[PDB]
Assembly symmetry: T
């Protein structure tokens, strides 16, 4: 007990409400991205169907894992996430996805646009999130890297050189 | 010798009633997935770890079922619709509370919503089987899986 | 634009006592088949000993999984299964196995007869079980075809052409 | 020996000759589909070569497994399958597959046509097969589902929207 | 050189008392398997999931041990007997209640049953080991596994 | 700086004799696969399980070999032809009986047909090797595998 | 042209004694946490015994991996770690664990406080560690977030509504 | 039948001397784990990699052994004690030097430590086995594993 | 504290009689591996495949056992000898005939050889165990495995 | 309803200085991979096996790192250049000798080259982080991995 | 011991310098092929991006394994391989790969040309390598087979039928 | 349009006694190599003990697989192998291994010479084996190159500068 601490109750780090809202925005955008990825996965037709069909499923898997990680971090810092359908639909920022069958060029353009919007949201939040908690800033770094790689892999088909 | 001659053989096509019934199943499965994840995150109390893991198993099963139904919908040449606006506006499952809940409340809520989800499938099964037994089999599998999950979740609060 | 239900206490499907009794018949025959299969697995001797030894173990595995599935189905439909040794011994319909070491042909004949008896019981139950619940009818179909495959694989050894 | 049966030889289900022929038709169509799938797998060239090259191999795998299951069921019900080359060539119903290298659009049209023909045969046979044995009707359900999924995944390439 | 000039060399044969003792072990293991599955199905109440899984582990271990003992009995050229009539008429474990039980009752019953099963092996071990240490080792392994399972199940109800 | 300049470098092209010899190999492998499956289904008698499993191993090996040969044919810019009409009209394996056969008859038949296939491969190997050793290597592998399968199947009926 | 370097004796990054002392503090706290986690794993008893038993094993695994990573980093930067029992016992800051059998509520409270103390130590050190070497700052981020997740999973058991 | 008519059946309880002996084993296993990790980190010199890997294998084995012994102590209803203060105050292994040590010195030190650890088990075995052969088997396994590791670590310094 | 103040601690040393007994075990295990492989290659007749696979399992087990015994001999600081000249000049198993044998002859020969191998271990066990129970345990394991293999191989020719 | 309207949302674009710095990293990673392979092939002497395996591990790590950096360059819409001419003309690592080398020389050379590779990354990190922390994180990972490899290789020749 | 040899030092097969150079040519071409494969893997854009992106990675993997096998054989026959960047760049025979982003058709043509050049080099060397060592000729056979299969799989995209 | 053969009793390839004797030589040398490798594995001691310990085990595994392959080829060509201990000891050509504990340098030298002797035997046999059957010549090629690689990995430790 030379250097041992005599404290009987050691408390943890608590996030501020601004921190909670800044993480909530990321959460809702990731959930909306998952839903739109599945929709575009089902309803795409045309030339080069198979490759896009598989890449969209990879995108959806990554988005689901990321959203779960963010929500678990919010719980770990003693905040309350909200991932209900009403809240997601009412407060998401991604533009609405059109219905019916869409050819592959349209799907490529739409998905590139929505991935870019999600990454923009993460980039806007990162400044304050890093100024408060670098450990959460690191998770944001990982999400940005993954989403940008997926965006490149999807948008590269439609390039003309 | 006995080979066919036709070069443009067509396949089976679903009717609009078929499409509507499968849409009714699909929106409920997606909403169940979302509510399962919410209850997975926001539960506290005793047996927290057990409910935490069981809800993740339920969410996995629901996601797989929804994908199977949507793929069958496309295979029979119909168009599924799983957007957030449509799900939130047309689902029949009751809304989930938004804060932390003790485990007894989560057990009751999840049992209620799984029962509603199974009731939808049991309601549409008669017409779906009258037109396509192959899809009736998928409905049978969904009913069996969901009922087993409901038993596993609801058995915690039994009195004796 | 909102169709959510209000009813907060929704109850599930409830099985009838006749349904429970029929599934009980199925369960008790499966358990007895498992026990007799293990006995024949241990005490067989003669020609093709290794082949009969392995096939009987595969049959036992299949029977155990089937009985577990049926019992879990009863519990899911809010009925109470009964798989105690006294009940199985006093209620099962399979004729009893001889006690000592049996040559290969005798074991083949006995196992073919008992598997046929089990499948006959399931077929007798299927009509009412299907008239009440097709979801359970599907499990009955699976058990029937698995057991018939095993019966062919075991009985085909002794057939002479 | 209270409720135990005293029967010394219990016999199983026997299939009628009409049942045997109804399953024989399914068997020969599946084998012919496997052979044509391999041919189209080898000889396709043009744009989007790789995706079709791999999807055809998945189709061949599924067809082989289904054929083996049907033949094993036929043996289980004391019927005799016939999968010889002369019988398949003389009695199959699928239209003949052209030779030489074929571009991808032609291969997609041909394969969609032949998968639809196979599914049509199964659907024609299912009524009587189900009226006699639901356990075999269930296997027919599974085959129809798998084949229709493969048909969608192959035909979706040439859709113009 | 030193090679042995025999054509048929005879193996080790067990005595009837040895066979009877191993039969006593085998019957109890089989009855434990059946009772474990019963308690696995019909348990219900608080902390349902953990008991639901631990009973499955116990049943798996009991089945493996039973097969090992029966194979040893055959290897020493004796005849095992694992029929339902013999098990039900000659087992020593107390009877299991027939309806669904709360978790505390299941824990108490399973602890008692495992204790009886281990007591049988401890009674038989001296006589078995006086003849065959190789079978004594199998008995050691069975005792170890059963006692660990008994601790893991019984620790639920301790109050301290 | 020893780099080449040519920008339209062409590959090896097979001759029509090369293509004919590889076709002769391919049709026999496909017919062997079909006959193996038939014998796998329709055998009864003693050692039924053993022949049942061995024939499935043989069919797997034959399928992989035929695929390798056809892919080599395509790689050397020749066109394979594995349609059912061509196989039935041009194969050299003797016709297989159409009913249930006892195991001795199946052993004899399968040994005869495997020997015929290996004889065809050995007949074409001289010219195929004199033109392309890389394909000669694949033929060596096929010969080795088929001979091992023939031994494993034929050894059951040996006299002493 | 050619930009190859000439210097044939190229030296690496060297850590300062303050850097070494800070990493030593982190290492000793991780080792003490591993030992206390194993003790609590063995001697807990009561309700939810199985769940606490498994979670404590996961905590011990994570702590062992973290301590090994920190010690290997210290070696990689030409510093010498100390992991001896006398040094750990005389230097660690975590309060000592009670000796006998403890009910699950007491174990939950004790483990929550000890994990919080360990995370507080890492948080205090991270400032200087990051000011000198961000590559090590990243490892500290990983340890912090893993430990906070484990703390949430353990402490959530006793929360009331 | 022959079923036993009891409701609560008591198990086997270990004596305090039994608990003390198993505590003596446990403390040395934990201290050996810590010293193995220390020598793993701080070794340097010729043939660094082989020692770096063998010490990790030794540490894994020691950790598994200590866990098995402590679980057995709990199963026989005794209370283990593996706290840092108790280990540092009551272990019998000699103290380990604190800086970088060349490979020959590390080999000598680890051989000495493993020999002391095995000597403790050999001294305890007679008294433990006079009461519980099932625990005697665990001691046998520990002795075997540790002696094999001692051979593998000491063989490098032999000169012959 | 209680730490021991030594620098070099001596381990357990095996006596030459102990070494000779373990040599007697090792030579027979190696010879059994060789004879098992020979019978595996040259068997022929009815039920060929089953013996062809069972002999391979027996050879694998014998190889692992011989390696374990040799490593134990090295661990107790003795020197094994497994050269071909020593095995051929000192083994006790009867010689194996050199041509193709029917399955009944092979079954009889292998049963005789395994019985001789087990008899050697049973003769050695008392003297080994009186000194080292840890090695007695390894002998127990070898005896168990060989007995089970002998049962599986001999059970074909039993008539009843 | 707070959804965006913009339908041509653009991404983050790297600057030419960013591209140049990442190119500086990439050429050194490729050159280190090639030199690791060379030293892997042409080493002789003592501890040959250990260095043989460690150099393979280092080559694997370097290849994965170079691929990650190139994919990041493409993701930020920059064009990597990893051709042999560019690598040979612009790399900064000292040239590797051409014949077979004793192990001490290889250890010294590889330590020097890994140190130079890490120095390049530490030089570019300031600007890369001031522009994009997400890429700064990848550079952190590369530095960590390379430094651990350097420790594991260089610890062989340390005096005490 | 009638047949035992009394030799105390038996030496192995040694390759001639011409043999060494003949294998050196194969080594340098394989390394250059690996580098160009990775370059084309990174820099390709256009239609059907994904399939080519993955096939080039498979080609690179095969080339790396082949080069390792050849270099280890060269060491085994006691020769000294040389796989340095200066030597490869100065002495390779494959034509230079252009820079910047390249559309898929151009990449297909370039990769077909370079794989054909590599196979031509191996075929040129095989005659003498076989006249000296059949065991090495066998490795050359394996390399030729693998490379030609990859060439077919890559060039089949541009065929017009 | 029918080319089926009539010959119903078709015989395979039969090996000559000289062929059988040559393969017998190869088999006996491989078995003796396995035995000596295990001996050296057990009794080596000194520096680099662990490395030689593992390498000798890998060599023994390779030799065992090779001997099994050669014996099965002998059986497949209808010849009778003989791998008894008396025959191996009387007819092997490898020099006898020393009995007691031996340092690592001595083991390296001994194993190098014995592997070279085995490969020399295979090379002496390959000419006639290939002149009669190239399919067996291919197996000989595989054995030669595997053994030479093992010889390199073992002998390379003792090379000086």
């Amino acid at each position: 007990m030379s250097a041992r601490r005599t404290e009987s109750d050691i408390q943890g780090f608590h996030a501020t409400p601004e921190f909670g809202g800044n993480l909530q925005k990321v959460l809702v955008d990731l959930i909306e991205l998952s839903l739109q990825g599945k929709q575009a996965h089902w309803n795409v037709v045309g030339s080069n169907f198979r490759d896009l069909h598989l890449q969209l499923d990879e995108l959806v898997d990554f988005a689901r894992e990321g959203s779960d990680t963010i929500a678990e971090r919010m719980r770990a810092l003693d905040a309350v996430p909200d991932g209900r359908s009403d809240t997601v639909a009412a407060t998401t920022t991604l533009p609405e996805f059109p219905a019916f069958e869409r050819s592959t060029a349209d799907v490529v353009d739409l998905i590139t646009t929505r991935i870019n919007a999600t990454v923009d949201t993460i980039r806007r939040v990162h400044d304050a999130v890093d100024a408060e908690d670098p450990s959460t800033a690191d998770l944001l770094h990982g999400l940005i890297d993954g989403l940008e790689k997926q965006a490149w892999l999807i948008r590269s088909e439609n390039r003309k050189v």
